[PDB]
Structures are given as C-alpha cells and as structure tokens.
Short mmCIF file of N, CA and C in Angstrom, two decimals:
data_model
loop_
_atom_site.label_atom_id
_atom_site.label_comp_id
_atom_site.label_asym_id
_atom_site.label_seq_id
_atom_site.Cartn_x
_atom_site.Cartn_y
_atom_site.Cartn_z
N UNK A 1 58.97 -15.80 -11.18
CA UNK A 1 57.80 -15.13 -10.62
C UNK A 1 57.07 -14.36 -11.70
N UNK A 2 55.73 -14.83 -11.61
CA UNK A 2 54.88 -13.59 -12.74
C UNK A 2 54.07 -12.83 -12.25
N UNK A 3 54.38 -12.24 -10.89
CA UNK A 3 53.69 -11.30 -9.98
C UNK A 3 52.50 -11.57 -9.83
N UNK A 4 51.81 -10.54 -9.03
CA UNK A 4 50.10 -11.16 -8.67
C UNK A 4 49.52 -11.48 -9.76
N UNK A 5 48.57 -12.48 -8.92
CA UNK A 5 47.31 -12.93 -9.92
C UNK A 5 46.30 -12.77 -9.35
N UNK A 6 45.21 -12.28 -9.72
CA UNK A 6 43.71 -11.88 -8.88
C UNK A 6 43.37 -13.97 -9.23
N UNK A 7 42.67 -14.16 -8.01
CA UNK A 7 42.07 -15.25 -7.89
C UNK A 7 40.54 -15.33 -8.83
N UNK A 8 39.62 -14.48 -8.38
CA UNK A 8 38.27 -14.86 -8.85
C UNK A 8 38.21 -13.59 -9.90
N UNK A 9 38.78 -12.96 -10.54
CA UNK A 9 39.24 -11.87 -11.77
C UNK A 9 38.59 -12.41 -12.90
N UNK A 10 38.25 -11.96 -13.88
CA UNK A 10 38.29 -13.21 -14.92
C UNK A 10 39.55 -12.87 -16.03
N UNK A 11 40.04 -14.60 -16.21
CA UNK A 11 41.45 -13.56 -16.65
C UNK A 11 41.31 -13.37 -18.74
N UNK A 12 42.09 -11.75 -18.00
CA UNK A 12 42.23 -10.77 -19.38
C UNK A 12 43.69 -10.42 -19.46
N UNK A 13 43.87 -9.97 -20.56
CA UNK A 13 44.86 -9.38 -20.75
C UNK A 13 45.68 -8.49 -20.08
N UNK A 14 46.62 -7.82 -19.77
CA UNK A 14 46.91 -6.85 -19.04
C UNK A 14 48.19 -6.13 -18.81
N UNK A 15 49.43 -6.72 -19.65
CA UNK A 15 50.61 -6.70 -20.08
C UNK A 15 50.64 -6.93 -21.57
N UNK A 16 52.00 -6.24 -22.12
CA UNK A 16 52.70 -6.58 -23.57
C UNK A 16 52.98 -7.79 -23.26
N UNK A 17 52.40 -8.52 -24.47
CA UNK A 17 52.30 -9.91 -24.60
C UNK A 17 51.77 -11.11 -24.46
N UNK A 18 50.66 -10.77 -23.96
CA UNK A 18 49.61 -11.55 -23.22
C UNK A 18 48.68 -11.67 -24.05
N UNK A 19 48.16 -12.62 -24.35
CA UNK A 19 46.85 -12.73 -26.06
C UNK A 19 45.44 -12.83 -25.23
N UNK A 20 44.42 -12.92 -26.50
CA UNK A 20 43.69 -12.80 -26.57
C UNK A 20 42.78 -13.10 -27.64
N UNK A 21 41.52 -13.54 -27.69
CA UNK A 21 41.21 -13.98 -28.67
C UNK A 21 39.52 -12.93 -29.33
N UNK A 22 40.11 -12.97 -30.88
CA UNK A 22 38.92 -12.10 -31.25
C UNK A 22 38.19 -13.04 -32.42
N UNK A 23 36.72 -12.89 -31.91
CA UNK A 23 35.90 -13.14 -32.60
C UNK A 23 35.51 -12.51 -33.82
N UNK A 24 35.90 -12.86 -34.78
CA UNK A 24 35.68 -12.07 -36.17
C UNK A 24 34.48 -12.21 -36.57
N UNK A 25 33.76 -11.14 -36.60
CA UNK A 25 31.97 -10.94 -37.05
C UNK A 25 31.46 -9.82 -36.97
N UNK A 26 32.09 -9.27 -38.54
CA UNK A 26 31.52 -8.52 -39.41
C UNK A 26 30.58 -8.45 -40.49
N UNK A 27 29.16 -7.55 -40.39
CA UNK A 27 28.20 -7.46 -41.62
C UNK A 27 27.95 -6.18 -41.67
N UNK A 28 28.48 -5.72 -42.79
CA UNK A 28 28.13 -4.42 -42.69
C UNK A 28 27.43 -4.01 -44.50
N UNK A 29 26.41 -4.05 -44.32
CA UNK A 29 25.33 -3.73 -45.88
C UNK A 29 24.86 -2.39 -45.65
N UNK A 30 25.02 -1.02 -46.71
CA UNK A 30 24.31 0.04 -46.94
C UNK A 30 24.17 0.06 -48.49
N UNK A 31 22.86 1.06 -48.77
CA UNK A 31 22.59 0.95 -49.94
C UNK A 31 21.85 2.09 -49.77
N UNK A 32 21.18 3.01 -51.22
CA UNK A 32 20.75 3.88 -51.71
C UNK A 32 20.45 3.86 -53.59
N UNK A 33 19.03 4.87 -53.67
CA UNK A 33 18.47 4.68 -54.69
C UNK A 33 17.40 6.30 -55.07
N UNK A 34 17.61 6.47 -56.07
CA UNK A 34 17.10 7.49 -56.27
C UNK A 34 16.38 7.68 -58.08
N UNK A 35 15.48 8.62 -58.01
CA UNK A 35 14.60 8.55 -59.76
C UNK A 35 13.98 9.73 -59.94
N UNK A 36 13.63 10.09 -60.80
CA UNK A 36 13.16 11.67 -61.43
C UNK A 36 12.57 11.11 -62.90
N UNK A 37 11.29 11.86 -62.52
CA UNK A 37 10.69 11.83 -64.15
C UNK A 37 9.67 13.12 -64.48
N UNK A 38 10.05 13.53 -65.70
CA UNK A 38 8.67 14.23 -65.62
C UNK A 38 8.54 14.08 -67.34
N UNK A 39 7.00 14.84 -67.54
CA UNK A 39 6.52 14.33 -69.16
C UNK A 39 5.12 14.97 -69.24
N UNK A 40 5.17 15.73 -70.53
CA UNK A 40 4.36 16.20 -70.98
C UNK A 40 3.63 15.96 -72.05
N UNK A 41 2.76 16.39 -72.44
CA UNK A 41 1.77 15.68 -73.57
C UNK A 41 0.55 16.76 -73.97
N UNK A 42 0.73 17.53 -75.24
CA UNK A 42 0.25 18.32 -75.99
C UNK A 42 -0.64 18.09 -76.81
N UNK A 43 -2.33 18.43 -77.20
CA UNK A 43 -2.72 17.84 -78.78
C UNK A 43 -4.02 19.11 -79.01
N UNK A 44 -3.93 20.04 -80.22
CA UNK A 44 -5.44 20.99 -80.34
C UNK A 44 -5.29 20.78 -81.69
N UNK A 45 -6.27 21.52 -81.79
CA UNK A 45 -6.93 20.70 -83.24
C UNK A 45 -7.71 21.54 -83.10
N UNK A 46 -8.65 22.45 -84.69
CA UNK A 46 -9.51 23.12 -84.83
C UNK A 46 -10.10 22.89 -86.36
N UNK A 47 -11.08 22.40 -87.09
CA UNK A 47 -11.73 22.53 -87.65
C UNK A 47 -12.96 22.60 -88.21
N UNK A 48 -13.06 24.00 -89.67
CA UNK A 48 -14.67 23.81 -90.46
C UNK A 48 -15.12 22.67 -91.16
N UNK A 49 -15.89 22.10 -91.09
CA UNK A 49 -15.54 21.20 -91.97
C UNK A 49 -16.92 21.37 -93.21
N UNK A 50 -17.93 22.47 -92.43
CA UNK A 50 -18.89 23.28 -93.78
C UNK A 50 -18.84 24.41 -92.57
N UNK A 51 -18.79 25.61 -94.04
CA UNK A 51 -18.48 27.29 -93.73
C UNK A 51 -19.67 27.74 -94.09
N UNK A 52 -20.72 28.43 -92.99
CA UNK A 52 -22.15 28.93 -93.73
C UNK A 52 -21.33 30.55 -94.65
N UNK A 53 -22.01 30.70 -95.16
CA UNK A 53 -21.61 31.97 -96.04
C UNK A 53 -21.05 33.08 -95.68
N UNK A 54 -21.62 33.83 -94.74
CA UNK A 54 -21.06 34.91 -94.03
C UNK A 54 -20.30 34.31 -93.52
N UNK A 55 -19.82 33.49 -92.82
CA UNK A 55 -18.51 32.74 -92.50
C UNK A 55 -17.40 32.71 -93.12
N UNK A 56 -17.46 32.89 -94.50
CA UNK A 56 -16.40 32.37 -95.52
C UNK A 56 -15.37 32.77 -95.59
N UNK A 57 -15.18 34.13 -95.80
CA UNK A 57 -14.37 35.08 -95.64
C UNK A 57 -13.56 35.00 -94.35
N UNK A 58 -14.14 34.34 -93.49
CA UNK A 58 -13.38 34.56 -91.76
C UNK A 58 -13.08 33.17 -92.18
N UNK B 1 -32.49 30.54 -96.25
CA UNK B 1 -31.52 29.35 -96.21
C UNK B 1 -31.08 28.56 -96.95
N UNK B 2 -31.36 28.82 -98.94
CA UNK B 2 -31.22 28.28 -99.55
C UNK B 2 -30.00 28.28 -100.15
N UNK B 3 -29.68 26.80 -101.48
CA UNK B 3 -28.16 26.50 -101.55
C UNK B 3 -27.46 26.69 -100.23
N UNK B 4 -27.25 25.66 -99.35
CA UNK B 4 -26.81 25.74 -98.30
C UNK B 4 -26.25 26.93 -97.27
N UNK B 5 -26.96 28.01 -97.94
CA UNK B 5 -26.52 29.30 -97.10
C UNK B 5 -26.17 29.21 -95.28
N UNK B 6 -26.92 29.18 -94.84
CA UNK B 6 -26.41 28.60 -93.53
C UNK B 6 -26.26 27.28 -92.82
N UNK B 7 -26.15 26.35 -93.73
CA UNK B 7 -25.17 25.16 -93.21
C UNK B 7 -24.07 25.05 -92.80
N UNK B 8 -23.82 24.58 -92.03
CA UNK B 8 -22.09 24.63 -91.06
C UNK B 8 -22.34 23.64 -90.46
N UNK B 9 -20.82 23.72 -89.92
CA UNK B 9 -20.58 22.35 -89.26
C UNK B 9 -18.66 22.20 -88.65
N UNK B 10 -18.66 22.77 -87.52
CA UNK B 10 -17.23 22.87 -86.81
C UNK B 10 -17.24 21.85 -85.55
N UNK B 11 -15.58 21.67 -85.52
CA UNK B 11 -15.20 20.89 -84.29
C UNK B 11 -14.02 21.14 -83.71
N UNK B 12 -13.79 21.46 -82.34
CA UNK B 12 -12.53 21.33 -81.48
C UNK B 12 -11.74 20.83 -80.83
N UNK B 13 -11.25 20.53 -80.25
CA UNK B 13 -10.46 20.00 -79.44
C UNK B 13 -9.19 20.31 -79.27
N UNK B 14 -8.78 20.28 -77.49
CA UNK B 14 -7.09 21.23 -76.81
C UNK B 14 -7.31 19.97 -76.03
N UNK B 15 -6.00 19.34 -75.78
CA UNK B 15 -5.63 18.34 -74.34
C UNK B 15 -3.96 18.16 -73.96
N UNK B 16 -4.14 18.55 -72.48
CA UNK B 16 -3.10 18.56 -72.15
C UNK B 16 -2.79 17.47 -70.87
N UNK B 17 -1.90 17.31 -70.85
CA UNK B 17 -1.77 16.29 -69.52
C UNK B 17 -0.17 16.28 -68.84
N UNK B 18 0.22 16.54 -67.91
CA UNK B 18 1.37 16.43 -67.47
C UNK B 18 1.62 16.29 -66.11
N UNK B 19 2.76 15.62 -66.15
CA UNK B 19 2.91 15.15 -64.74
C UNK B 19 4.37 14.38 -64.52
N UNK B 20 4.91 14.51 -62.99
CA UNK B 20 6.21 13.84 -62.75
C UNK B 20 6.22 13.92 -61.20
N UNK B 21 7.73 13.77 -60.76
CA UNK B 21 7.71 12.66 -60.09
C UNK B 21 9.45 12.55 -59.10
N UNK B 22 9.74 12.34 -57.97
CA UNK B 22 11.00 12.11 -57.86
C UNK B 22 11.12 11.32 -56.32
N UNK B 23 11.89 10.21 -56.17
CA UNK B 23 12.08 9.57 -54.84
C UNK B 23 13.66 9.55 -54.20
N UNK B 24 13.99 9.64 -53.61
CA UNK B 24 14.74 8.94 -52.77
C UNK B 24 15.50 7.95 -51.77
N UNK B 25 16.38 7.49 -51.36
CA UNK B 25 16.14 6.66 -50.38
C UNK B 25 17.64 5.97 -49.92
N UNK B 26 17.92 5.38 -48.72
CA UNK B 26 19.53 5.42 -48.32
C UNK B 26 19.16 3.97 -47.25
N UNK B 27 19.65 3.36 -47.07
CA UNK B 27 19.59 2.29 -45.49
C UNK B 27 21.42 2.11 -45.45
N UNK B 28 21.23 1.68 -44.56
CA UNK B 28 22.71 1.68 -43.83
C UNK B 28 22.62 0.70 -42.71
N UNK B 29 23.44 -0.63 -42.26
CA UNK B 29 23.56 -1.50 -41.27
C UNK B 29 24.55 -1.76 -40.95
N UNK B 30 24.73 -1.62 -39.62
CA UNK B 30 26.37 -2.62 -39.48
C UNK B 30 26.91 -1.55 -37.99
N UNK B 31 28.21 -2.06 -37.74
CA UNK B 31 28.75 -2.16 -36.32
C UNK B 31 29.98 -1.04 -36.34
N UNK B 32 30.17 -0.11 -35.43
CA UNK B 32 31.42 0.39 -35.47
C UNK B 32 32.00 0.87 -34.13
N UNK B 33 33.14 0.71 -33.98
CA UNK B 33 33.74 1.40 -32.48
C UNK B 33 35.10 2.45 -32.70
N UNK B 34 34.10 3.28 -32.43
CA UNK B 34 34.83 4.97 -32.39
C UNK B 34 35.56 5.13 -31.40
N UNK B 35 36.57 6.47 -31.23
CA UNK B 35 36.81 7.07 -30.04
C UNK B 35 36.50 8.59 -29.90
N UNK B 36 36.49 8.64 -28.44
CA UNK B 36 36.02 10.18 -28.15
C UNK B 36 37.55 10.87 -28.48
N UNK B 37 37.61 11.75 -29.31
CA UNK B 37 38.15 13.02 -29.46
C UNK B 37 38.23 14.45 -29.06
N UNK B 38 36.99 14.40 -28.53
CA UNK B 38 36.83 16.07 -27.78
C UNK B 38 35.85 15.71 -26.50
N UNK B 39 35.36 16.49 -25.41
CA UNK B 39 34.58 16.89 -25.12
C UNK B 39 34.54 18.43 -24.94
N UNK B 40 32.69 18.20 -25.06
CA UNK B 40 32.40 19.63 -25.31
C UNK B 40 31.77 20.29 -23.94
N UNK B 41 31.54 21.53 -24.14
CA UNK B 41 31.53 22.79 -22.80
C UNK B 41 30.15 21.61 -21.90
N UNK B 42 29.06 21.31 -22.95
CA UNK B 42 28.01 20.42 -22.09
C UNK B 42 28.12 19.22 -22.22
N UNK B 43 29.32 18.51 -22.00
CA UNK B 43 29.54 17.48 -21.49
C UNK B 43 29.67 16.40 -22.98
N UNK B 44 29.13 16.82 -24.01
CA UNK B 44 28.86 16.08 -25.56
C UNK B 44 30.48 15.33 -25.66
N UNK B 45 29.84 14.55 -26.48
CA UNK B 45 31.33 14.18 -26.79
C UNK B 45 31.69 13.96 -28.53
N UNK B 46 32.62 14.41 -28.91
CA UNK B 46 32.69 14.14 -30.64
C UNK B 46 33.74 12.59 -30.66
N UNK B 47 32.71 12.02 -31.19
CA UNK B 47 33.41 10.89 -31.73
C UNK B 47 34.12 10.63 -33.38
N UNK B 48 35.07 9.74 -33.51
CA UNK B 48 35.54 9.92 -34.62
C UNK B 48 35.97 8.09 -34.88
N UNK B 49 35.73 7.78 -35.89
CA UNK B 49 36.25 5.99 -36.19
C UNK B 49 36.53 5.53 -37.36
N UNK B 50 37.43 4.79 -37.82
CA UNK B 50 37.49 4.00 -38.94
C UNK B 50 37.91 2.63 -38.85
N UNK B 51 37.38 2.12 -39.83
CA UNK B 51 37.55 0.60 -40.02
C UNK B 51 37.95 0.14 -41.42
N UNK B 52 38.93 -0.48 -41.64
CA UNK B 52 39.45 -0.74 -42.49
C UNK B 52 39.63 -2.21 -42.88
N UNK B 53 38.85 -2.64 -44.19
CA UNK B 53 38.99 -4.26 -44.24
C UNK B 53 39.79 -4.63 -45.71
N UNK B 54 40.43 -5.24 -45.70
CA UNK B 54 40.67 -5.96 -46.79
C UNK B 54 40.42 -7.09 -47.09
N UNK B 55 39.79 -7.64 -48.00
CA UNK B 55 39.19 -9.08 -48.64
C UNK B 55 39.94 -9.81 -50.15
N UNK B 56 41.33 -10.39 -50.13
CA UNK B 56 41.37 -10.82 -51.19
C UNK B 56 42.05 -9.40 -52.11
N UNK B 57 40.71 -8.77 -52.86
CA UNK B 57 41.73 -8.05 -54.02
C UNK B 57 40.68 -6.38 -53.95
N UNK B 58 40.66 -6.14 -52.83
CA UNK B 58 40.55 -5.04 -52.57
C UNK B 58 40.79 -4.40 -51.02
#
C-alpha cells in the first residue's frame, strides 16, 4: 500500500524520496564602470618690445 | 618726438582653461530565491538568500 492518492492533484512531490525534476536556467550578468578627470592649462606672457623714454627706467 | 622719444610698442597675453569631469555606473540582471527571516512590527518582511554555483574550476 502507498496510501492515498489525490485523483485530479497534479502529482508533486510530497514524501522523503519522491523526485522531481529541475530545470536548470541560470543567467545571471552584472557589471559596473566608473572615470574621473580633471586638467588644467596655464599660459601669460608680457612684453616691450620698444620702450618710449620715460618708460625706460620702469 | 624726436630720435624715437616716444615710440613704443607692447603686448599681452594671460589664458587659462580648465575643466573635468566624473561618471559612474552599475547594471545588475538575473534571478534569485530568498527566504523570509524576520517579520517586522508593519508586517515588512527581511529577506535573506544565497546562491552558490560552481563551474569547472571555480
């Protein structure tokens, strides 16, 4: 005897020992991304290139 | 104004420029089945799960 059985049940598992079947379907994708910039840029410049007279001295 | 007494002749220039910059970014896909571990005073529930795969040589 293997005790009750439900008629219209759908049959599952329900005791030690009783199988079952697994569909293996796994996808598992993560990802990450990251950036830093920084930048500078410097340029002066000063020249006489003719000194009127009273100028000269300065 | 004579012998070039007040003749002259100057030039300048300052330039600066700067600038930067920073992004981020994360995606994440895929399947997992947790269990409840607590419930809380409003009904919440804390879940907790792991999944563990091995492939070959890891």
């Amino acid at each position: 005897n293997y005790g009750y059985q439900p008629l219209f049940e759908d049959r599952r598992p329900r005791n030690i020992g009783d199988t079952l079947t697994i569909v293996l379907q796994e996808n598992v994708s993560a990802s990450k991304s990251s950036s830093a910039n920084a930048s500078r840029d410097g340029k002066t410049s000063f020249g006489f290139d003719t000194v009127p007279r009273y100028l000269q001295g300065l | 104004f004579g012998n070039s007494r007040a003749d002259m002749e100057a030039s300048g220039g300052n330039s600066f420029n700067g600038k930067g910059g920073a992004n981020a970014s994360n995606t994440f896909s895929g399947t997992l089945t947790v269990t409840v571990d607590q419930v809380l005073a409003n009904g919440n529930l804390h879940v907790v799960g792991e999944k563990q795969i091995a492939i070959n040589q890891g």
